[PDB]
Design a protein around this ligand. Structure first.
Ligand SMILES: OC[C@H]1O[C@@H](O[C@@H]2[C@@H](O)[C@H](O)O[C@H](CO)[C@H]2O)[C@H](O)[C@@H](O)[C@@H]1O
Ligand SMILES: [Ca+2]
Length: 582
């Protein structure tokens, strides 16, 4: 039924059934945040710049008070202007509900205020001044249609609202839900999208995502032409074009094939007995067969993460790693953790864990390091294999771990509510504020929630440490790189001592394309957007760059910095402005 050449078929982004289209619900559906709701400004990792999207510009009143001016054209899909009240509303709702976009804003933002119809003002909290979070929450604030949400709240609990009626859906992005059922989710373009004159219309009229049960079935679909825009783990992906001559590609045409997405962790629930012991978590770190698993199970699509949680694939981040502490701690040339069952057993022995007759460790207090599961979603075959290789090694050191692979939604439920034992999951990636972002996401108790309550915002492992809080509250009280640095280095000491969870590998930014119906995909040859994976939070510009094969169109002129004749503002220009307002 869908017009094939006017539709982008997608894979690897939606796993399990659709849920809601409500970022305030416990779970929501792929596409909701990506395409339905846009921010004031879109961070562009590729260029280290910011696209003014819903906002046309900012002004620092002073260094702690930022005003953001909404484009006059910015307008919800129902014709109601997007206004400052929508910005205030979205954030206040998140604080009230304990869930929603911009979780944690109130920790570092003193107030968000609508100073006029199209003018929002954000003010940094000065007690725990943090310029990075001040900028992050404000520039990337996503408004929500207050006039919509208020009426829902009159009628039911917000957290229960589904938002699944297409004709009632009210969005800021260029797409909204068209149709769904147990086997597919489909979005349709908003042809009179407010952003049409500034940004153009995205070329696909439809985004469709057939719900595949597992990797092999999605891959088969991709091999046969049925997926244009894929975000999948695929084994030996190069074979698709090198051997099978299919019209498909990836970012790179040779080894890594994928750019990095972020840091994949073996998360260890700190609230469970045994797993609550830093010694046990440290022993787990030495028992991960990093290289063999990344080579065999991950196909070299990504490499071992540094234990500082800093993504050292990028030269600019390396200054934030205390290499002398890491090398001294782990005895390796760059300070990575070696796979070493001897050390793993040694750590366990020197903490007084002793194998019982069944081979499973018991601690000096009688805690058995056993039955635990390590879990990832069913059908995520790369992660499943990695789980099996990890679980085998843990068992041999007397930590009784078995794999379990439930439906994505079940897995997500246990992850977010902190009822898992071990999992592999994601965290965050390269960003203007990186390494801060990952410490904030993984280690900060203030973004967690009690066991049994959902968090998407951070610290699934329920790590609890007041010192980290204090260091995050201090790390960017001034813009002096050296101050960040020292806070980062101290957090690193704490990480090596507590091993809150294990940074294991750099996740791949899964991204594959077919040129059968759509061309001008972003790639190393055509590096127009650096987050093109269909599931990425920041995927949307990809849809403005591709063209129908039957009608090639040039790359949008708004891409590129201001000095290149685009509309994007360098991060350096924003800090220059911040500085200048001091
Ligand atoms: O590599 C693990 C699996 O990753 C899947 O993509 C994930 C997205 O759907 C998810 O929501 O975001 C994470 C961030 O790490 C992605 O890894 C692939 O679709 C699967 O094929 C793959 O096995
Ligand atoms: Ca969004």
């Amino acid at each position: 039924s869908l017009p094939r050449e006017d539709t982008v078929y997608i894979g690897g982004a939606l796993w399990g059934p659709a849920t809601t289209w409500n970022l305030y619900a416990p779970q929501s559906t792929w596409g909701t945040d990506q395409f339905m709701y846009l921010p004031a400004f879109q961070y562009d990792l590729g260029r280290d710049a910011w696209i003014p999207v819903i906002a046309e510009r900012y002004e620092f009143v002073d260094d702690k008070t930022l005003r953001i001016y909404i484009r006059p054209e910015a307008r919800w899909s129902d014709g109601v202007p997007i206004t400052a009240d929508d910005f205030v509303y979205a954030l206040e709702l998140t604080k009230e509900l304990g869930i929603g976009p911009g979780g944690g804003w109130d920790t570092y933002i003193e107030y968000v205020k609508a100073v006029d119809t199209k003018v929002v003002e954000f003010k940094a909290k000065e007690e725990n001044l943090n310029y990075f979070q001040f900028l992050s929450y404000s520039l990337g604030a996503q408004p929500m249609p207050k006039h919509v949400y208020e009426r829902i709240r009159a009628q039911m609990n917000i957290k229960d609202w589904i938002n699944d009626k297409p004709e009632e859906q009210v969005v800021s992005g260029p797409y909204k839900l068209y149709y769904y059922d147990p086997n597919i989710v489909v979005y349709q373009r908003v042809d009179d999208w407010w952003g049409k004159d500034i940004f153009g219309l995205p070329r696909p009229k439809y985004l469709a995502h057939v719900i595949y049960k597992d990797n092999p079935s999605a891959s088969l679909a991709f091999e046969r032409g049925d997926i244009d825009w894929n975000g999948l783990f695929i084994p030996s992906v190069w074979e698709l074009w090198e051997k099978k001559g299919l019209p498909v590609g990836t970012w790179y045409k040779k080894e890594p094939y994928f750019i990095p997405d972020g840091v994949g962790f073996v998360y260890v629930n700190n609230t469970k007995p045994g797993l609550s012991d830093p010694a046990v978590r440290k022993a787990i770190a030495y028992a991960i067969p990093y290289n063999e698993m990344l080579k065999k199970a991950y196909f070299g699509y990504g490499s071992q993460a540094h234990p500082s949680m800093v993504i050292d694939l990028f030269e600019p981040y390396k200054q934030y790693i205390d290499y002398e502490l890491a090398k001294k701690t782990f005895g390796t040339e760059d300070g990575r953790i070696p796979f070493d069952l001897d050390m793993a057993n040694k750590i366990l022995d020197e903490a007084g864990y002793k194998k019982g007759p069944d081979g499973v460790r018991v601690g000096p207090d009688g805690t058995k390091l056993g039955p635990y599961t390590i879990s990832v979603p069913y059908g995520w075959t790369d992660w499943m294999m990695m789980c099996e290789m990890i679980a085998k090694n843990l068992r041999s050191i007397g930590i009784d771990v078995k794999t379990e692979f439930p439906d994505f939604s079940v897995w997500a439920d246990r992850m977010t509510k902190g009822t898992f034992d071990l999992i592999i999951s994601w965290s965050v990636g390269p960003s203007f504020d990186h390494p801060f972002n990952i410490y904030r996401f993984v280690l900060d108790k203030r973004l967690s929630k009690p066991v049994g309550e959902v968090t998407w915002a951070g610290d699934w492992e329920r790590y609890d440490n007041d010192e980290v809080v204090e260091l995050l509250d201090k790390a960017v009280s001034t813009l002096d790189p050296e101050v960040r640095k020292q806070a980062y280095f101290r957090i690193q000491q704490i990480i090596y001592r507590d091993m809150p969870s294990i940074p294991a590998f750099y996740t791949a930014h899964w991204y594959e394309y077919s040129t059968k119906y759509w061309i001008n995909w972003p790639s190393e040859d055509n590096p127009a957007w650096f987050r093109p994976s269909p599931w990425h939070a920041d995927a949307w510009p990809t849809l403005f760059i591709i063209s129908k094969k039957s009608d090639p169109q040039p790359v949008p002129s708004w891409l590129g910095t201001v000095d290149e004749g685009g509309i994007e503002i360098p991060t350096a220009k924003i800090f220059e402005d911040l500085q200048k307002a001091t």
